[PDB]
Amino acid sequence: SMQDPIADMLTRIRNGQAANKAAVTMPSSKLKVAIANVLKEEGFIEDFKVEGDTKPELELTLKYFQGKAVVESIQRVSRPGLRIYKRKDELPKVMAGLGIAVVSTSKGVMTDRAARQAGLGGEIICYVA
Amino acid sequence: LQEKLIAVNRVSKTVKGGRIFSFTALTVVGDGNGRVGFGYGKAREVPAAIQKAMEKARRNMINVALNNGTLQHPVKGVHTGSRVFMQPASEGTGIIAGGAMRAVLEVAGVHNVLAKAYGSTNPINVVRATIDGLENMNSPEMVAAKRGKSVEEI
Amino acid sequence: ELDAKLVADSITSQLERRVMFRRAMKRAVGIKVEVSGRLGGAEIARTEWYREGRVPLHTEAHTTYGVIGVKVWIFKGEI
Amino acid sequence: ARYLGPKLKLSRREGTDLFLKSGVRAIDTKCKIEQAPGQHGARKPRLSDYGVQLREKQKVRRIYGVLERQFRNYYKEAARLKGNTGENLLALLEGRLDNVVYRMGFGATRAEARQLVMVNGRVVNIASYQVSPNDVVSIREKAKKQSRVKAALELAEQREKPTWLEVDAGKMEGTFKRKPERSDLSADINEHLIVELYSK
Amino acid sequence: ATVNQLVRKPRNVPALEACPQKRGVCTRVYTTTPKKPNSALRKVCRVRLTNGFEVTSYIGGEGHNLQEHSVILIRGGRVKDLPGVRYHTVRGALDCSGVKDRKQARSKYGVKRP
RNA sequence: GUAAACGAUGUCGACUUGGAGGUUGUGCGCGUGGCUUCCGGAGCUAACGCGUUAAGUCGACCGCCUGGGGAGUACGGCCGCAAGGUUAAAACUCAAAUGAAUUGACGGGGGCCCGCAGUCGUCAGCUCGUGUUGUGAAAUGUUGGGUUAAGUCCCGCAACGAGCGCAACAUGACGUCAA
RNA sequence: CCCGCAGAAGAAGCACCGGCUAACUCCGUGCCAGCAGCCGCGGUAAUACGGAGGGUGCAAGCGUUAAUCGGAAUUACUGGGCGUAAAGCGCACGCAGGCGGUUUGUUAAGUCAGAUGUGAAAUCCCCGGGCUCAACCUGGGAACUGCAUCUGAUACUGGCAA
Ligand SMILES: CN(C)[C@@H]1C(O)=C(C(N)=O)C(=O)[C@@]2(O)C(O)=C3C(=O)c4c(O)cccc4[C@@](C)(O)[C@H]3C[C@@H]12
Ligand SMILES: [K+]
Ligand SMILES: [K+]
Ligand SMILES: [K+]
Ligand SMILES: [K+]
Ligand SMILES: [K+]
Ligand SMILES: [K+]
Ligand SMILES: [K+]
Ligand SMILES: [Mg+2]
Ligand SMILES: [Mg+2]
Ligand SMILES: [Mg+2]
Ligand SMILES: [Mg+2]
Ligand SMILES: [Mg+2]
Ligand SMILES: [Mg+2]
Ligand SMILES: [Mg+2]
Ligand SMILES: [Mg+2]
Ligand SMILES: [Mg+2]
Ligand SMILES: [Mg+2]
Ligand SMILES: [Mg+2]
C-alpha cells in the first residue's frame, strides 16, 4: 500500500524530469504544498498550483535550463521506516551548500540554511540538488 | 599537456598456431587547469600501444570546473564495477588518492583532494569513474544559472 | 645507408656492439629485415622481423651468446 | 645514530648536489654527480611511483643528516601544526639550530658543524633545537682559535648567505628574524611527495 | 537487510595458544615429500608441546641435529608445500643447533657472527 | 511434506517513451477496462540481458546471503509407521571455487565445398594502418548474395585502404611439430 | 651541572636486493641442497637456493614469531547484496510486531530551542610555561558528543476527539 506520500511526490518529480515532462500532477496535501513552496522559492520548480476541494490535485511545473533538468537529484531522507531528526548544529549541507535539505521545523517547512539562521533543528524531509 | 601512463597490460588471443600476445596502454593527458582526457591504445609492441593511447587521450578531453586546485563539492563517480568518492580538501593536503585516480586528478589540475575507490579497482574503469565524477561536478555559477538566482543567493 | 650489404653489416656489427636488436632493425627499415638467434642473450632463441612497403618475393653477428643470423630484402622498384 | 659513511654517494644516488661537501674543489672533479653509486651505476631504470616518493624523502633527509625516526616525528609535527603540512615540514627543518652553525659558516660541512656542537646568550649543544623568530644565535669565545672555523667562514663567504638571517663578523652572531616561507627555499624539493609518502 | 531486521537481529597457529613461541619434545623426526609441483626431502618433526598439543614442525636451513626426545622451541609459520605443517623450529634455541656455515641472514638461522 | 515445487525473479502500492499480437468484458470505424504473449526505447546490468507483467525510478514489511570444500553432514530438539523431513554446527583442508562474455581448438553438432579420399600444403589462406563498435578480452574490415582453381572477381555492406599469399612476370604466405 | 687531563683514542650492527617492494652481478649447486607472506623459485649460463662483490632500507638496534585494529564497502548504521556469481520460504492465510490516505481541533510522548545542574582528576586536543632540546613535567582553556530537570516551540511523527 501507499505508505509514504512525500517519497511518492519526490519520485513523481524525479521521474517527470527524467521523462522531460512539462508538469507532474499528484493528490495534494498540506505537507506536499509546504514542500512545493520551498522548491519554488529555491528555484528548482517553476510554479505549482492546487485544484479541487474534496479531492485536491497538486500540479508542479518542472523547469529545464540548457536541455538538462534542473533537479539533478532528489532523495527522501526521513522515511516512515526510519525517521531522521537533526539539531541545529548537525543540519546537513547538500552538495557543499549548492543544494538544499528541506527541513520540517516547529516554525514550518524550510531549507537547511533558513533553519540554521532561525536557530532551529527538525526532521530532514529530503535532499535536493 | 602533462601526460601520464597509468597501466600497461599484456593481453592474448589464441590462434591455430598458438597464442598472439599484444599490449594495451591506459594513459591520461591534461592541461593542469581543469581539462583532462583518457586514452586506451592496443598494439603488438608496448611503445606503439602508448602512442595510440596518447593520441586518443588528446582528442577525448573534457572540461572540469575546478576551485583553487580542489573540487567544488563531494562527488561520486561510477563505471562498471568501479565506484569512486572524491571530496574537496584544504591546501597542503595533496592528492590523497590511489594511483589511477591520482594520475587523473594530477593532470586535471586537482592539487588537493581526498578520494577513495570502492568496488573494482580495475584501472580502466576507475579512470572512467573518476572522469565521470569530475565532469558532472557543478560550480556555484551554473547552479545559480539553472536555479535562476545570484551566486550570493546560492 | 641504402646498400643492402652495408645495412646488413650495420646490423650485425651493432649486435656485436650490444645495440638492442629492435633499434638496429627499425633503423635498417620496399624493405624487410629478419634477425634470428639468442636475441638479448635469451636462452630461448627467437626470430623477429619488420617489413615496410612491398616485398613481392614471388614476382652473421658472432656474439657472446652465439651466432645471430641477419637477413635483408629491399624492393627498389621492378626490372 | 649518525651516517658516518662516504658522503658523495648520497648526492650521486639522489642525482643532485645536496650541499654535503666543504667546497675545496668542484663536485664534478670530486665525483660523478651524473652517475648513481656502485657497479650497476651507469644503469638508470624506471623508478616506480613509490620509488620517486621515497627518493624525494631521502633527498630532504640526507642533506641534514636526520635519521628516519626523527624525520617521521617532524612530519607528525608538520601535519599537526595549522596550515600547509609540506611547508610546515620544511619550516621545521629550517628552524633547526644545527643547520645554523653550518649555514652561518662555522663548520665546513654539517658533519663538521655537528662535531663543533649559544642562543639568546645561553649555550645549546642540541642539533635539533628549534630556533624561534627574534632569537640571536652566536658562537663562544673559547673555541675561536680553531683553524676549522677560520676556513669554514671563507668557504661560507663564497656561497649565497641566507635571506632571512643576519650573520656578523668577529663576535660572530645572527638573529633568526622570521621563519622562511616556501618562496625562500629551493623550488626543487617537491615536499607534497613526502606528505603523500607518510599519508600512505 | 532492512533496519527493522537489523534491530531484530544485528550484524592458523592454534597450538601456540597466542604465545610467540612454545617449547616441545620431538616424538618423531623424518622427511616428507612436498606437494606438486615441488620435489625434495623436507625435514619435519612431530612435536608434543608443553601445553599437550602434538604438531608437525618444519626444520629450516641446511642440516639439523634433532632426534626423538629433542627439546625445541617452535614459532608460527606454515610451509606452503607441506599440507598440515603450520610451525617452524627456531634454529639456535635450546637443543636445536645453529645452521652450520651460514653467513647471510644469520639471525634467522641461529648462527653467531664469524 | 519433498521437486530444476523455476520466471532459478517475495508480497503490496506509486511513478516513467513506443510497436505488434492473443484472450475476455463494455461505450459511442472510433473509444474504454481486465488478464496475457512477443519485440524494443530511456534507464539499469559484470555481461548475458531486463525493459509499464522491470532486472527502471521510489516507499512499506518479510525471507535469505557472506570464499570453495567438510555439509544441508554430525550432535541435540521437534515431526514421521517407515522412508526420512526440519532446525543446524565444528575440527580439518585448499588459494581458489564461481558468473558472464572473448579468441581458438574440438564434437560420434548443422550447412556449404575440395583432393586418386622436411612437414601440414601450392592448402587459400594470414595480417596490418586508420576509422568505427565494445567497460574489456576483442570485433569489424576478411561476414553476406553470386561466381571462381583461387580472400578469383562482381555486387552489397561502418568501414576505408594496404601488405604477404592467388594470378601474372619452377615458384612453398603468416605460422605449426623445442621436427 | 661546571672546570681540567690524555689521546681517534674505548664504541656498528641487523634485515633485505624475482614481482608485489627501495636495491644486481659473478661463482657453487643442478626438482638436489634448499627458499617461500602471496604468486612462485630450483631438473647445467638461477638477479628467487648457498657464498662473494656491489647495492637498498633501518640503525644501538635490526629482524622473526605472537597479538589487535586498519586496508576489508569482506556483517555494509554511516556503507553491500539475492534472474544466471552465495542468497526469494513451494504457495497462502494470519496473531504478535513494523508501517500507515486525507481535513480540523486538541495534546505535547517523540522531535526542536533555551536555561540550570551534573558529566572526578589524569589522559586526548589547543594556546602557553619549565627541564640546554626532546621525551617528560606543568598553567589555563577546549572537550567530555552524555544524562537529568525546568521553561518554551508545534512543522513533522505519536496520543485523543470529530
Ligand atoms: C556455543 N554455541 C551455542 C554454538 C552455536 O552457536 C551453534 C550454531 N549452529 O550456531 C551450535 O550448533 C552449537 O549450539 C552446538 O550445538 C554445537 C555442537 O552441537 C557441537 C557438537 O555436537 C560437536 C562438536 C562441536 C560442536 C559445536 C562447536 O558446533 C557447538 C557450537 C554451538
Ligand atoms: K618445482
Ligand atoms: K558485451
Ligand atoms: K516473507
Ligand atoms: K573454510
Ligand atoms: K582495426
Ligand atoms: K546498509
Ligand atoms: K501533533
Ligand atoms: Mg572506446
Ligand atoms: Mg572486490
Ligand atoms: Mg635512538
Ligand atoms: Mg527445497
Ligand atoms: Mg511446476
Ligand atoms: Mg515453467
Ligand atoms: Mg528457489
Ligand atoms: Mg491467471
Ligand atoms: Mg525486451
Ligand atoms: Mg539431515
Ligand atoms: Mg536431526
Ligand SMILES: [Mg+2]
Ligand atoms: Mg580468415
Ligand SMILES: [Mg+2]
Ligand atoms: Mg587477393
Ligand SMILES: [Mg+2]
Ligand atoms: Mg566486403
Ligand SMILES: [Mg+2]
Ligand atoms: Mg604464382
Ligand SMILES: [Mg+2]
Ligand atoms: Mg625495484
Ligand SMILES: [Mg+2]
Ligand atoms: Mg649458474
Ligand SMILES: [Mg+2]
Ligand atoms: Mg599479523
Ligand SMILES: [Mg+2]
Ligand atoms: Mg569494516
Ligand SMILES: [Mg+2]
Ligand atoms: Mg557483495
Ligand SMILES: [Mg+2]
Ligand atoms: Mg549453479
Ligand SMILES: [Mg+2]
Ligand atoms: Mg545461485
Ligand SMILES: [Mg+2]
Ligand atoms: Mg517463489
Ligand SMILES: [Mg+2]
Ligand atoms: Mg498475506
Ligand SMILES: [Mg+2]
Ligand atoms: Mg498519517
Ligand SMILES: [Mg+2]
Ligand atoms: Mg516533549
Ligand SMILES: [Mg+2]
Ligand atoms: Mg575530566
